[PDB]
Design a binder for these strands. Sequence first.
DNA 1: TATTCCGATAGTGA
DNA 2: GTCACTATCGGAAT
Lengths: 200, 200
Amino acid sequence: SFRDNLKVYIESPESYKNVIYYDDDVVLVRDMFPKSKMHLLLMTRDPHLTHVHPLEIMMKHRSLVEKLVSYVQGDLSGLIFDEARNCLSQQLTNEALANYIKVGFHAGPSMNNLHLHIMTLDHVSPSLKNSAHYISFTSPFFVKIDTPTSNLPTRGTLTSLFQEDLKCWRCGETFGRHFTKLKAHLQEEYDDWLDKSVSM
Amino acid sequence: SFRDNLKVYIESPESYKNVIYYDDDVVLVRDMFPKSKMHLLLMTRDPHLTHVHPLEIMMKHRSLVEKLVSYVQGDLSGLIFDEARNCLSQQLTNEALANYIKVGFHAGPSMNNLHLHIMTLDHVSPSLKNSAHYISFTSPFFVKIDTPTSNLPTRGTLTSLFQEDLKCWRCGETFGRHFTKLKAHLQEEYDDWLDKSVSM
DNA sequence: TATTCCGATAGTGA
DNA sequence: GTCACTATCGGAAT
Ligand SMILES: [Zn+2]
Ligand SMILES: [Zn+2]
């Protein structure tokens, strides 16, 4: 099944150059279809935990949540900032980049192996091809890793999000269902953010 | 306006080789986007009648209706059969062709100059490109010229027809909204009809 | 809400 | 229900 496509990264990380980190516990791998300039996946290698739904992970597996956050903010932090500088600009400091990165799970992932998204905010990417892509990362469907448990969405409830009008995440401008127009505007927003960020 | 596109044929039929007949009263012209193998338009040149709605023509202009029918069955009859043989097959007799030709108005034409469609039944044509095309010629939206007045549709009432599932005019097979599949089937139906018709 | 391919659907401009 | 262009929307296979 296509839904098991990610299992090869946790089973044989030694085989993939796009696996930019692995140890006995986790794998950090580049998303094959990046939905922002930088888009990485952090995957547990635990044979049981990998098949636990991310909302259940957030609710009842706080040790794993803390462990993943610890990887992101510690041992993988330098690596992630270098990936971001290569994907965006060498001229961007850790401080600028940290405020331009989000980390979270999809509330309804299609792939069955638990994967934590670590990505830049731009959503400027050739692989961003439709409204559902965009909405999945910019609505409550994207469950940020620091969401309090009492604020988690209920499994299966967010279907209707995907039919809503499009709004730019940065400035709030609306685009109805005109995805192509949104796309062009996201480019502009990135150009703007970059100019402002390097200008210090 | 694009809606006045046909007026050139009644104003200056002398200028167009695809005007296959003209006199002081009418013009017979090839449809520029034929929706069957043969698709002709018979147009009154009368400055007033040309802008009368076809349903009003059918209801209250019986002399013009009779005159158009007289052209079709009389002085233009040989011409129409030749067009049909060239468009379909030389091997088809007048008798076979007469049962494979329909004559009628659209209940809601876009073009403003009154035009009577004279066309073969096949609907096999590169210009037949969507469901609305097909439905416009095979439903009550196509008002056959011999429709009794008491059985005419009311102006503006047939909008909903265009959303219905597709059915083959010849054998009744249904295709949902799969237009491409209908198209392929119409080809087959034409091949079948042709084989049967020349086989005397 | 995995991608990709095809095709139906919708709005516009002329 | 003029055409033609663009883009959105929808199902199916993988
Ligand atoms: Zn914006
Ligand atoms: Zn049929």
